[PDB]
Amino acid sequence: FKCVNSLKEDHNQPLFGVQFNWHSKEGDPLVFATVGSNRVTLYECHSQGEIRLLQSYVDADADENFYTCAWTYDSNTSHPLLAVAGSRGIIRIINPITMQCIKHYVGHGNAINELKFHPRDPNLLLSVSKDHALRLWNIQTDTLVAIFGGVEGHRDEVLSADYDLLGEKIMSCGMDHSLKLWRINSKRMMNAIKESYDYNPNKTNRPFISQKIHFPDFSTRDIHRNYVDCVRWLGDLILSKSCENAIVCWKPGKMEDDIDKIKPSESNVTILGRFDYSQCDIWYMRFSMDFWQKMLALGNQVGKLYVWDLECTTLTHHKCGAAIRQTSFSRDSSILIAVCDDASIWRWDR
Template identity: 60%
Template sequence: MSDSEESVPPLSKKQRVFTQVQNDGSGDEMDEISSTTSTKEEESSRSDTPTLVSRRMGSIGRMKKGWKKCKLQYKCTNFLKEDHGQPIFGIQVNMNVRDGEPVMFATTGCNRVTIYECLDNGKVKVLQAYIDPANDENFYCCAWSYDEVGQPLLAAAGLRGIVRIISPLAMQCIKHFIGHGNAVNELKFHPRDPNLLLSVSKDHTLRIWNIKTDLCVMILGGVDGHRDEVLSADFNIDGSRIVSCGMDHSLKMWKIDTEMFRDAVHASYTYNPAKSNTPFPTVSNHFPDFSTRDIHRNYVDCVKWLGNFVLSKSCENSIICWKPGSLDYTDTNIKASDNTVSILHRFEYRECEIWYMRFCLDYYQKIMALGNQVGKIFVWDLDVEDPTLCRFTKLSHAKCSVAIRQTALSKDGNILLAVTDDGMIWRWDRIK
C-alpha cells in the first residue's frame, strides 16, 4: 500500500455477500453469511495459549438460545490488504468526532500505523501511513485523542515498549515516551482528560502519562499488582476507576478518584524541570482496590466497562459480564480483601481459543462485536433490558478464514471494521 493510494473501490454486486437468515433445522446456520468450511492457518506468536480443556458439548447446548434472529444485520461492502502482509493486531475508530463527520480509523500492524477514512458506498480511503524507523518494531495497539485546539492525536505502541504520539495534522510523530520495560499491549485515553494516556505492558505494570507535559504521572503495579503480562485495561465512563487484566488470569480494579492521584495529575501540569533539581515524582500504587482470579481459568486478554459492570474475555469461548461483590454491593462497601464476584451473564461463541483476540463496543454501548480464529464475527445486540435476551448475528465471508484480531464499530454502530492475521481489513455496513 502506498501513501498515494486514493481509495479502494467497493465490491461489485456479484462480490457482495448479504446477510441471509437460513433455517434448515440444524441451528448452526442462523444469522450466518455465506457459511463455508474454514481452514485455520498458522497462527502468530501471540497465539500460544496454554492447553485448555474445552467443555464444548455443554456450551453448544447453551448457545442454541443465541441462534434466534437478531435485529442487527450487516453486509460486507469492502475489504483491502495492507502490503506488509503481516498480522494487523489493532484497529480503533476515532470517537472524538461530531455526529455526521466522516468515520476515521487507524490500524496497527508490523512497524506501520495507517489512518483511513470510510467513505460512502463502502469505499475506504487511505489518508496517511507511518513506518517506524526500527524494522523490528511491531505495533500492537493505538488510541485516539485530541489536542488543545481539537485536532486529532493518535497514540501507538507495541513490541519495543515505546509509546509514540502521532499528529495527523503535522503528518509526523511529534512525541515518544520510554519507560516500560517491555512490550505495550493496549492504550486508552482518559474519558475526561484527553492528555492522560493509560498504557499496559508485558512488564506487569500499567502507566498513566501526561502527553502534554511529557511526564509519567503514575505506575500501577508492584506488591499486589499483576504477576504476569498485562494484556488489557479500560477506564470507566467517568474516569474514576480502571479495570485491568492479564496473563496471570486475574482482573484488578484501581480507583483513581483519590487525592493522591489528583495531586499527581496537578503536579504533572505544573512541574517545571528548569526550576527543579529533581526528576518529576511519579507516584506508585502497589495495591489495587479489588482483585479476583475467579472469573477466568486462562489468559484474560480483553476487558471493558459496561456501565457499572465489567465485560471480560479469556480463551474459553465466552465473554463474561460480572461485578465485584454480591449484587447488592456498591462501590463504597467493597473492600480490597473481598474477592467475591457476581456473574450476570455469559456471551458464548465458538472457535476463539487463542489469546490476544479483542472485542469492541460502540460508543453508546448498545452493540458488541468479536471476531474468532477462523474469520467469523459475532455481533450482539446489547440494547435489551434483560441480558439473557441478548441475541447475536454471525457474519462470515468465503475469503476470510484466519484469525480476526480486533473489531471496531463506528460511533453510531452503522459500520463494523475488522482486522486479520493476513493483513486484511474488512468493512461491514449495517442493513437498516
C-alpha cells in the same frame, strides 16, 4: 450488517489493532487507524462502501511490532492525536494530519499490550505492559503520573485495561488470570494528576516524582482459568474474556454490593451472564463495544464476526478466513471494521 468492502495491507503481517476516531464532528470524515508490523495506517470511510487510504506511518525501527493504538485530541485546539505502542515498549504520539511522530515515551521494561485515553481528560494516557505494570502518563506535560504494580500488582504480563465511564477507576487483566481494580479518584491520585499539570522541567532541576501504586482496590482470579486478554466496563459492571469461548459479565462483591463501597479485601464476585461463541480459543483476541455501549462485537480465529445487541448475529464472508484480532465501530455504529492475521481489513455497513 452487510460486507461492503475489503482490502489487504502490502506488508502481509497480522493487524493487531483498529480504532475509529471518535473525536470527529458529524459531517466530518469517518477515519479509522490500523496497526500491524511497524506500521500505522489511516483510512477514510466514504459512501457506497468506499475505503480511501489517507496516510501511513512507518516506524524507524523495522523490528518494531505495534500491538495497539488510541485516539485523543489536543485540549487547546481540538486537533486529533494518535498514540501507538507495541513490542519496543515505546509510546509514540503521531500527528494524524502529517502522520509524523511529535513525541515519544520510554519507561516500560517490556512490550506495551494496550493504550487507553482517559474518558474525560484527553491528556491522560494509560499503558499496560508485559513488565506486569500499568502506567498513567500526562501527555501535555510529558510526565509519568503513576505506576500501578509491584507486590500486590499483576504477577505476569498485563494484556488489557479499561477506564470506567468517568475515568474514576481502571480495571486491568492479564496472564496471571486476574482482574484488578485501581481507583484514580483517590486523594493521592487526584493530587498526583494535579501536580503532573504543574510540572515543567524548564522551571526546576528536580525530576517529577511518580506515584508508586503497589496495591489494587480489588482483585479476582475467579472469573477465568487462562490469560484474560480483554476487559471493558459496562456501567458499574465488567465484561471480560479469556480463550475459553465466552465473554463473562460480572461484578465485584455480592449481588447488591455497590462498586464504590467494595473494600480491597473483597473475596466475592457475582457472575451476571455470559456471551457464548465458538473457535476463539487462541490468545490475543479483542472484543469491542460501540460508543453508546448498545452493541458488542468479537472476531474469531477463522474469520467469523460475532455481534450482540446489548439492549447473536454471525457475520461471514467466504474470502474472510483468517483470525480477526480486533474490530471497531464508527461513532454512529453504522460501520464495523474487522482486521486480520493476513493483513486484511473488512467493512460491514448496517
